[PDB]
């Protein structure tokens, strides 16, 4: 039941502002102290801020003191983080964390990615990867989708609207020399199924508000 | 302030082996210490509270002990779902300082990579570029040599490799080697192959441009 949901992630120019919201759907959010913690890419955890029961007292580390403010609304059960004058060091995945009295940090959010850059949003380009001639050369065959030249992250990929989940490998994104991320998502399927079932890769890029459903069917 | 130092910084053990992580404190913290587990990308999960006790949901193979300076987290039977980073965090006095973290990697039987090769799509060919993909699936260890041979010619500088995390069920890896190549340069050659060398094995998957 106890679940924390986060919203507000996106792309912000340096020096801009952004408001993050964390809603508690399981408990009162009143009797618990709350915290904001970010994780930069390839870097460990870093506690950022904390708010008490009534929101009368707040804490924030010296690195982000003055720029970040933390508030709460117990009527709406939502913890708010106002970020001002962003810097490239603030590009990180932000989490809202609960704190039981005697336990520690129990429940976290799913994470909202915040990217601070002067670049512009770029939608993904989805291409099929469906050999059929060299691929009948084996029992299991590979069907894939290549997601090229998108920015920023994240981009999620599913198969058959989530109906296919066994054997999927969605590779991590590589930054590439052009500054645009790219990845590939490949699944293994029986070759005899290449003519009966139709596989579609569903690529979602929320920063660009783009959703591409590519039917990856065999070649000629 | 208190400083938490973990040991070891990383570990490699096989399935079923018992593992032990030590967390040393710069001063006395009584029993106010917790152990958290965090998978790559996902949020940390509370494992041990009050240095000895088990949170609801976590499996029974996790333990805990420590007096005032040396705390210990033990996993009795290591399982493929336990690939993560485990960190100790104090709670006696604010700020709650955490340890540097301990990475866990499973050591498993060597598996031959299932290797496929993917020609560029005509839709991408319209754009003026062409990506030829080599996929390595379900192999151990991660170390492998992927060479791109175009008309029996070693290609350098046009290759970019992506590596998945260790699987949570069979602890195998997957590689994706992409060869980006200009359409004009792509039309001057016919046979494209990728060669994967793990040990004494050297598998090569090829295709002729224009088949079917």
């Amino acid at each position: 039941e106890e679940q924390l949901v986060e919203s507000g992630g996106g792309l912000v120019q340096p020096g801009g502002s952004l408001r993050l919201s964390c809603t508690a759907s399981g408990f009162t959010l009143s009797t618990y102290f709350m915290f904001w913690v970010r994780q930069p890419p390839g870097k460990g955890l870093e506690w950022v801020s904390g708010i008490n029961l009534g929101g009368d007292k707040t804490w924030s580390t010296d690195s982000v003191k003055g720029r970040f403010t933390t508030s709460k609304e117990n009527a709406k059960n939502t913890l708010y983080l106002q970020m001002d004058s962003l810097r490239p060091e603030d590009t990180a995945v932000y989490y809202c964390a609960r704190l039981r009295s005697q336990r520690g940090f129990d429940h976290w959010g799913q994470g909202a990615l915040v990217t601070v850059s002067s670049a512009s949003t770029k939608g993904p380009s989805v291409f099929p990867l469906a050999p059929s001639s060299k691929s009948t050369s084996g029992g299991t065959a590979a069907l894939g989708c290549l997601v090229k030249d998108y920015f920023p992250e994240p981009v999620t990929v599913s198969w058959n609207s989530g109906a296919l989940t066994s054997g999927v490998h969605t590779f991590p994104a590589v930054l590439q020399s052009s500054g645009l991320y790219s990845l590939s998502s490949v699944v293994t399927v029986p070759s005899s199924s290449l003519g009966t079932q139709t596989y579609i890769c569903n690529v979602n890029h929320k920063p660009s508000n783009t959703k591409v459903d590519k039917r990856v069917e065999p070649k000629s | 302030d208190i400083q938490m130092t973990q040991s070891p910084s990383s570990l490699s053990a096989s399935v079923g082996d018992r593992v032990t992580f030590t967390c040393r404190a710069s001063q006395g913290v009584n029993n106010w210490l917790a152990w958290y587990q965090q998978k790559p990308g996902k949020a940390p999960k509370l494992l041990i509270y009050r240095a000895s006790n088990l949170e609801t949901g976590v499996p029974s193979r996790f333990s805990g002990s420590g007096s005032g300076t040396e705390f210990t987290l033990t996993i009795s039977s290591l399982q493929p779902e336990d690939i993560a980073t485990y960190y100790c965090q104090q709670h006696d006095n604010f700020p709650y300082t955490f340890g540097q973290g301990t990475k866990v990697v499973i050591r498993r039987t060597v598996a031959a990579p299932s290797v496929f090769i993917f020609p560029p799509s005509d839709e991408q060919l319209k754009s003026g570029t062409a990506s030829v993909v080599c996929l390595l699936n379900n192999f151990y260890p991660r170390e492998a040599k992927v060479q791109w041979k175009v008309d029996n010619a070693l290609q350098s500088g046009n290759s970019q490799e992506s590596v998945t995390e260790q699987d949570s069920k069979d602890s195998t890896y997957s590689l994706s080697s992409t060869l980006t190549l200009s359409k004009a340069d792509y039309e001057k050659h016919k046979v494209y192959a990728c060669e994967v060398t793990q040990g004494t094995t050297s598998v090569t998957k090829s295709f002729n441009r224009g088949e079917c």
Binding site: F33, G50, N52, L53, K57, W59, S101, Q102 | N93, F94
Partner: peptide, 12 residues
């Protein structure tokens, strides 16, 4: 005041 309240919260 934050640390005092937080420690009191953690004790009880």
């Amino acid at each position: 005041s934050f640390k005092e309240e937080l420690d009191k919260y953690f004790k009880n």
